Amino acid sequence: NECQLNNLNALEPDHRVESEGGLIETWNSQHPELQCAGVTVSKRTLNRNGLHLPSYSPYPQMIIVVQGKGAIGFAFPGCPETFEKPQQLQDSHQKIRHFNEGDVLVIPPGVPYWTYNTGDEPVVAISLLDTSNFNNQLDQNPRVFYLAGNPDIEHPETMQEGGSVLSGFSKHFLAQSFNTNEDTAEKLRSPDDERKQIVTVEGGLSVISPKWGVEENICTMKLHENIARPSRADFYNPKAGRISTLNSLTLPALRQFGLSAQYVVLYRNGIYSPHWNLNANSVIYVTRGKGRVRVVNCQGNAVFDGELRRGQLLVVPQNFVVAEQGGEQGLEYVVFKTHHNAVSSYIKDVFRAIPSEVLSNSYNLGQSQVRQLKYQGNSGPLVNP
Amino acid sequence: NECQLNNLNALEPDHRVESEGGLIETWNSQHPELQCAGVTVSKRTLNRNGLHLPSYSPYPQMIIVVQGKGAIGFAFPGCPETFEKPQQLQDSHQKIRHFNEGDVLVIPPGVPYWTYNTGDEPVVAISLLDTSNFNNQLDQNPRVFYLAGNPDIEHPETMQEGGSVLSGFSKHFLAQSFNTNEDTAEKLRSPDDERKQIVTVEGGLSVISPKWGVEENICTMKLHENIARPSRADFYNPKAGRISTLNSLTLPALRQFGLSAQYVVLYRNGIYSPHWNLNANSVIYVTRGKGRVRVVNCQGNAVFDGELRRGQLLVVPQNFVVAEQGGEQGLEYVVFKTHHNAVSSYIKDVFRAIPSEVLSNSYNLGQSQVRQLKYQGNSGPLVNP
Amino acid sequence: NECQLNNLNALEPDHRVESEGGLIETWNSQHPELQCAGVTVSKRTLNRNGLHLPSYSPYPQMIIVVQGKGAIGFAFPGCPETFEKPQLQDSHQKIRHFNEGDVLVIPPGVPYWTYNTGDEPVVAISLLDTSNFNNQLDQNPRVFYLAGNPDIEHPETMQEGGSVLSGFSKHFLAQSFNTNEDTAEKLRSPDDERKQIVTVEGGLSVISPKWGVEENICTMKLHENIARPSRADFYNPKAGRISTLNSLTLPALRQFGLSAQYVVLYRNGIYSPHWNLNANSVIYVTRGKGRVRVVNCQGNAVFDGELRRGQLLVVPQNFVVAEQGGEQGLEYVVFKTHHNAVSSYIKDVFRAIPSEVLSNSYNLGQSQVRQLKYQGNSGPLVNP
Amino acid sequence: NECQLNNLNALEPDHRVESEGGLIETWNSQHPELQCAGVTVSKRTLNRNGLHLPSYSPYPQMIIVVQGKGAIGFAFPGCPETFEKPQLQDSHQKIRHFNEGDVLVIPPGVPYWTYNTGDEPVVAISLLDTSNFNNQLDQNPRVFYLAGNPDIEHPETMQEGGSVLSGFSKHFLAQSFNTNEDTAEKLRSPDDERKQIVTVEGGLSVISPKWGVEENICTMKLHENIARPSRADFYNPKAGRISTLNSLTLPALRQFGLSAQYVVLYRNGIYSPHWNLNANSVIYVTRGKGRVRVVNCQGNAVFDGELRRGQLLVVPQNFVVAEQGGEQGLEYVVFKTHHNAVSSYIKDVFRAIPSEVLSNSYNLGQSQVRQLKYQGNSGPLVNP
Amino acid sequence: NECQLNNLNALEPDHRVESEGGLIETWNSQHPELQCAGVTVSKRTLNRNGLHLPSYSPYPQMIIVVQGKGAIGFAFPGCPETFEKPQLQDSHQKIRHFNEGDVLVIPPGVPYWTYNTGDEPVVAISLLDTSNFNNQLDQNPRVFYLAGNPDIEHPETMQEGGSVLSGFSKHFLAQSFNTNEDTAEKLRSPDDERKQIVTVEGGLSVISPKWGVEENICTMKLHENIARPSRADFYNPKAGRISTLNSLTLPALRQFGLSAQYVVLYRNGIYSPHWNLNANSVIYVTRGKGRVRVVNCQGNAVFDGELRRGQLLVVPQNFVVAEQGGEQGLEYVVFKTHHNAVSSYIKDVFRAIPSEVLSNSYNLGQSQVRQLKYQGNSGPLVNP
Ligand SMILES: [Mg+2]
Ligand SMILES: [Mg+2]
Ligand SMILES: [Mg+2]
Numbered sequence A, B: 001n002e003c004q005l006n007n008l009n010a011l012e013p014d015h016r017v018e019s020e021g022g023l024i025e026t027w028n029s030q031h032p033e034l035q036c037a038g039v040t041v042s043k044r045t046l047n048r049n050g051l052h053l054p055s056y057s058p059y060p061q062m063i064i065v066v067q068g069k070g071a072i073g074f075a076f077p078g079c080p081e082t083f084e085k086p087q088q089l090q091d092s093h094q095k096i097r098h099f100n101e102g103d104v105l106v107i108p109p110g111v112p113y114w115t116y117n118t119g120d121e122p123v124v125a126i127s128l129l130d131t132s133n134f135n136n137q138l139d140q141n142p143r144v145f146y147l148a149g150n151p152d153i154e155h156p157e158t159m160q161e162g163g164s165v166l167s168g169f170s171k172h173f174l175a176q177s178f179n180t181n182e183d184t185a186e187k188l189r190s191p192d193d194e195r196k197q198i199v200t201v202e203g204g205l206s207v208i209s210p211k212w213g214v215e216e217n218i219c220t221m222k223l224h225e226n227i228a229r230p231s232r233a234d235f236y237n238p239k240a241g242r243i244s245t246l247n248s249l250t251l252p253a254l255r256q257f258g259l260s261a262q263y264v265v266l267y268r269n270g271i272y273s274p275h276w277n278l279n280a281n282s283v284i285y286v287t288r289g290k291g292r293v294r295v296v297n298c299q300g301n302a303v304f305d306g307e308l309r310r311g312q313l314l315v316v317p318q319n320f321v322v323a324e325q326g327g328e329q330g331l332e333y334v335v336f337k338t339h340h341n342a343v344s345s346y347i348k349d350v351f352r353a354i355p356s357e358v359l360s361n362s363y364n365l366g367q368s369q370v371r372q373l374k375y376q377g378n379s380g381p382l383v384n385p
Numbered sequence C, D, E: 001n002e003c004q005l006n007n008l009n010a011l012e013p014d015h016r017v018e019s020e021g022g023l024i025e026t027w028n029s030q031h032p033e034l035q036c037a038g039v040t041v042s043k044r045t046l047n048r049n050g051l052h053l054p055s056y057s058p059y060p061q062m063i064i065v066v067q068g069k070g071a072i073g074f075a076f077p078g079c080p081e082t083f084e085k086p087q088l089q090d091s092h093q094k095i096r097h098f099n100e101g102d103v104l105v106i107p108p109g110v111p112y113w114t115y116n117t118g119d120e121p122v123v124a125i126s127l128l129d130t131s132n133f134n135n136q137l138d139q140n141p142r143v144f145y146l147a148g149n150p151d152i153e154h155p156e157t158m159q160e161g162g163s164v165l166s167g168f169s170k171h172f173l174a175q176s177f178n179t180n181e182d183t184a185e186k187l188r189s190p191d192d193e194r195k196q197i198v199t200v201e202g203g204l205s206v207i208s209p210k211w212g213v214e215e216n217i218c219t220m221k222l223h224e225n226i227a228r229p230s231r232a233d234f235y236n237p238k239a240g241r242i243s244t245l246n247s248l249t250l251p252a253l254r255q256f257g258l259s260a261q262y263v264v265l266y267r268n269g270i271y272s273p274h275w276n277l278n279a280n281s282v283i284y285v286t287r288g289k290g291r292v293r294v295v296n297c298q299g300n301a302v303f304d305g306e307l308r309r310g311q312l313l314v315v316p317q318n319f320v321v322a323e324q325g326g327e328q329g330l331e332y333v334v335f336k337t338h339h340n341a342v343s344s345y346i347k348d349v350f351r352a353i354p355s356e357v358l359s360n361s362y363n364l365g366q367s368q369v370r371q372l373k374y375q376g377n378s379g380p381l382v383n384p
């Protein structure tokens, strides 16, 4: 009965991990709303020259960059290092991908990744940790395997200290394994490192990049897409707002990760009429502004009815009906959905699909009243009252 | 250990919901047999002019109409209203599908649907609610989201009153959302409606129908097929009975819903020899007659051994061996299976696949005895003793 | 440049084969229109007690039954005989019943036979998808009979003949099938003058209620009604109806590259200008008469005239077509060479394009544009 | 034997169509090279306020925008009008914006229109995949215009013309669209002398932020940037960069059998000997100049010369090719007739083969072999 | 009408290429039979210490090894060198061992080389699937050698030649591969008179036990034994055995459109009348002799005669064929142009059809019909 919730709360971060080069804030995965959704969320901040040390988790992550710009690099197993710099190579590594605010990034399960702030302002990103994803064969707990550094626990609720996976091996064995000296091997264990999982790169970081076979396809799996730019809108009403969808039809990698998302922008008083998601739980994170949100369950009860503003997280269970109205300054938010091609339906459109007399007898309405419901007013889900 | 059942009971409806235009009977989803199967069942009756108000659930439903005739209409999101009637349109809606006794209907997860009795006798349908379906991201509880009316709870065991999803919103907000007046909006909340989920349409219902791009495919997803007609038999022995299979190879939509079924008709003394389902749990609902049924588990124990008659439900767990023999008046039943292409095997056929000497040494049988088992008698699963 | 056609003709059968229990009429596969579409057509009539002897072809066939009722049986390789009557008096694969309005699908290489179970004759029109990707021989229609002594159904290809079994000696057939020379001789149909469709005196009798690998593949759905009023996917009570049959309704079609639609236009009903995005089409009028127009990429009406019952008209991929029912309406089936053929009607296109793009495109005023987009019924079926 | 070519030529447009708001230049589809690859190319220029009238073709088109910025709109059949401005002043399908460096994909049979939103003209090169499996007509390029009075863009195929709507009478158009004869007459573009690309005086205005089935299919991604420096999949700061665009980045390509790469070579940068395993390729130089060599199975350089901006060069499947940037570098797009074209460069091949196989193959000493395998950069982009 | 063949011939190689370490014999791709099937065949013999230099072709090849033992290595693009011997003395991709009875599959565009590891010569028959959908060039067989100075293996297509590397200058090769002119000169095989198969004096030595992307794609299964007695899918100890190799046993075949069967008939053993539903077939006799008969749709035996070791016989899709082992039996491989070719034998067909349909079809009595259906072994392999 994990989703038999009579109340839904707007949630904010519960735990904080302050590092040399940044901050990591996590929502406790044990909140009943998040347990129903089968996910948890993590907000990461990379300060100037901030470098998030390489790590991987046993489930996919969908991240939206809400501030700043940087680069992310993955370590795909067995793939060639297509970025090379001659000194005889002086260095070579895999493709460096750049991201900006409004972009969504996807981290594959088990694939190592690192990120770096390439701008002046701090990078702020919100990550949906899809812990319940079918690909996670461990358990519901969020887990982060660091390949470097001496991290602090990011999800403390699961401990009921941190260390890299390399610190679990002796320097002697690492020395032999990696055909290196024990001095190098000891450093690989981060024995005296006190910077934690996000460090500051003094002097700035330098990597091979134009801007700063298997290689053509798989090894270059597209893992980022802008979702917030106005021009990418899929639904639009100049006087109400816009809705943009990012799913497996845009980012094919999502098909195997069971995740998709939408970015919604509602202008002052703009309304996103009553709608529901047919095949997925959803998690709203407000990126800006404020608005009135209402979520109704199968008993016609509003499990949530209140203001929702920047920084808050609100779970909308599969099939529950939700509606939003932009406040004074409008409202913007991303909605993570636990399906690679999540589909929703809005009630206005439903009325149009049902025969006039079915509607009349259902709501005891007159022919003219029904007609006005099915044919009058703007057609889309975005309404300017 | 949800399926470690040492006993299986023939089950009948536990709860009843009497409405103006019909009746809804449900089997408690907490019976251990149903918990093992990961499903529950609901029997619906639409009286003359009976209209089942529009609703949707977060899992698929496979329904078999055992009596009467009517029409069902769905509300596919974003699809065009291909049925239109000029007065300038006087009304338009989506395709109306007709059904008759012996037909199976499939309801997609999250898709709204309504049904209406177009004949004189009442429509009686038995619905398999596939609550454990992978697409249900909530929890095991059955749930019905009504878009209209003031319903009573159909699965009371989950409350440990009813209302439409629209009654969860204020008339003022619905008024703005749907660009209508507050009078219409208040009626949309069904504030004074006491008819419940199945209403009687006085004077009969009228909808657009010849009989009473995306539109060509998806928006017209085939969601009904006759399963009981004699001529649709897949296995047949004039002196024993018949077996008909309905799976994803006949109704492609079933591939995504993980459901299939069979309709079996056994004549007097007709036998459906010992067989089992390799990849799916099964739920038998007797539509007519009576017969002796035996279910044996992995310890060689008959967890069920008795008469099974019209109206009773019997779960047959995956891999358990079952056999049926038509009684005096014969036996007819539908079997819902929780796989889009459920496959079964009958022991007679198994003997034929195993080498004679493997059989001899397995059962201490003589060469002649084995030969008679593998080659003598009718070949199929339907036996006339 | 097989489709660089400046003219399209309404075609009727050009060849006929008279047999004891029926008739087979075919359209010459060499007509420029049929060559562009990469198919040919065949009309088969089974008289009372008529039986079409077992045969198979290296490509799929989509058949619409326009009259009568009957049964069709296939021989799926290696599949068990699930129909049996108790030693076994007899056993055979599933028997499938059909009626007028039904569409049957014949898989490539799979033997099938048909029998008329009613009094009136069975009349069926078959689209022989010769250009199908599964046909690795050549674009010529071919029929491999397993029995009888047939006459060539498509003579244009030759530019006599027996069953495939007649190509073997009775001696070898006797050894192969572990049978005696007497039976083996008969398997070659040496003195059979009945041709491919025979009359079963006394009537045919088979195992059937009304008259593992099994559960699925071995008994896959190969027939579906397409003409019933209630099956309409598009409908305007004052104009007509359109029904679509594709891989979403009949899964096997996914592998055969074929789909169809059944159109019924009432008096003066119009199926407004539309085109198929991904497939060539072949119209066969089953009833009535109406005006049909087909326009190519140069804006030329390669066809502009009446089309009546029994006539065939090819509509090439992307060519724009429109139809209007005559005094007694018009009904027709449209075979399309794609498992999920998609069409688009111009009215709907106007709705998708911005007003000013339309205004500047056709030199129209905002008002007139508003007219095209929001006035009238929105569907493709129009009541003028 | 269309590809049994002993010679390959660098080709430039041979035909041109001047219209009011733009220009269309095409390469003759009959060049032996283009026939072997089964495609043709078209360069389209939209001048300021230029609008390319609605049209569709029976095959997919892959377009790279080499200059300017604009908007492209498609008309997906049966899809809802998700862009609306409040009765509705107007509503239409999604508007997609593009800039130089972007690749656009046009689905078969789907109408599309484009508009220049900037001051400089929009220049785009389109690969018309005429041999695509979805094209069931013939290998001839065809353009079905929904509006205007166009001139033939590919005249070689004829060996006048209007919109598909001009093929209908104004009377029938009036009845079909429930409109008056006046509007219907205009829908036929009878006195339009502007041709296929027109100039929108005052500028075009549409619904857009900057200027169910919806969520997915109805709004599928049909454009992606391929030329930005940051999108490089291969990179050597001293030699150049290679970017790949295929079905893994743009899903729709899976159904259209097309992919591409954008190559940028710096001064004297070399893209070492490589070949495409599963597709024919067509290079179009967007900037600079360089030496290109193409070798067939006989070890003959069917092409060995300079290739500069605006020139087209076909590289047949499996033929080995190499390029070297000139004094000012070389940039080019390569269209490939496969949704996921795979290539292989010889340097990498040496690494995969055992030393002694190599030694015995080329009569080299262990030392020299060691040279080929482990010395130098490992990638395909070489700085000599 | 390439398959409208009234006659089929048993074919033997017509051309030969003698090289230092082996021999290559080919069948002319222009034989009417081979053109109908859309393929050609090649027999390759590697003498002791023989090495077939690296090469690749724009279509898949299915090869059955009829004699000897050896190793085959491929060069998968961008894949890591997982075989290494410690700086690295050397590293290269996986080495795959094969023996007689094994079938090897060569992917389109992928370089491969083979080496004889035994004393007796390796003899292999290769089905060159030139008509494969992946081949976007033309139906001509082509071999792109990466090394050596080969002679044309399929001369009929020309109606000299070197390696693809010989098409480049040594200067450019030196720059491309970061090597010196000396090595580069050698990469062009200028004074090599050994041809495509060379003799490795002293024997070849490679990394191998016996002599991420890795785990999967980069090391996909490309070989499987098909001839071992124990692998039989069909078996009658008194008649023979049939083994099938398709995409269900070797996944890669799904992408190459090929499958095969290995048939062994004992003395007088019969493979009763059967046909392939979805593919053309090419028989190659590996041992013995027997009577083969092929009947077309007119009931004419387009082939009726003996077929012995080393002979090739095409059996077109849907044509009915039967074989009977001679005094010393008959063994043969059958290549089929479909990843999952399906066949059907007439005996099984009789079992699927109702008694009365059969009675009326062949004018047989209930008794005789009962004979065909239930008497004798039920399988396709018959002991007369
Ligand atoms: Mg929302
Ligand atoms: Mg049962
Ligand atoms: Mg039509």
Ligand SMILES: [Mg+2]
Pocket (backbone or CB within 6 Å): D321, D334
């Ligand atoms: Mg290139």
Ligand SMILES: [Mg+2]
Pocket (backbone or CB within 6 Å): E321, E334
């Ligand atoms: Mg054979």
